[PDB]
Amino acid sequence: HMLWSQAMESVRASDFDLAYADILGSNDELLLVRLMSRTGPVLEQLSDATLTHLMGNLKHFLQQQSFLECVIPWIQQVADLVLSNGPNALGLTGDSKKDLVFALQEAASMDHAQSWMAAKIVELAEQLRSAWL
């Protein structure tokens, strides 16, 4: 729990960027999902480098159908921020933008245990495609 305590210290200091950079830098999947569940979605409080690193993780979780109940509020925040602040709200690269939409599209066809999940994924895929593609 050493990394956990360190992350919680940064979280208490409202330094989400450092909590995420440290946890992401560890490549420990459990810690990342725990962190994500403990903090809000806090995409607005991350640097562009931290954000990019985190987005690769979210893309991977979509491709693997993992933790989607914990993950999908993060993609909701991507779409919320884009609607309210414009397409470059998160200043992601054009490739990351395209990859996230593609990963959402692919996740839409998976057999989800949650009856509402595929519809939520399709709605988000369509909002982000509209805003970016």
**Under 8 Å between Cβ of 17 and 47:** yes
Question: Could you give the C-alpha distances from 101 to 45, 47, 119, 128, in angstroms and in order?
Answer: 22, 21, 14, 7
Distance (Å, rounded) from C-alpha 81 to C-alpha 85? 6
Domain that holds residue 58: 2-132
Q: Quick one: CA torsion of 31, 34, 35, 37, rounded to 10 degrees?
A: 160
Distance (Å, rounded) from C-alpha 4 to C-alpha 19? 9
Q: Which tokens is 103 given?
A: 């990963």
Distance (Å, rounded) from C-alpha 98 to C-alpha 23? 25
Distance (Å, rounded) from C-alpha 111 to C-alpha 50? 31
Distance (Å, rounded) from C-alpha 71 to C-alpha 2? 24
Q: Find the angle CA(40)-CA(15)-CA(22) to the nearest 5 degrees.
A: 90
The structure was resolved experimentally with X-ray
* Angle subtended by helix axes 16-26 and 29-38, to nearest 10: 160
Report the candidate in 40, 50, 112, 28 with the shortest Cα–Cα distance to residue 76.
40
Q: How many domains does the chain have?
A: 1
**Under 8 Å between Cβ of 89 and 54:** no
Distance (Å, rounded) from C-alpha 8 to C-alpha 53? 20
How would you write 3-26 as a 3-class SS string?
A: HHHHHHHHHHCCCHHHHHHHHHHH
Half-sphere exposure of 126 (CA within 13 A, CB side): 7
State whether residue 83 is helix, strand or coil: helix
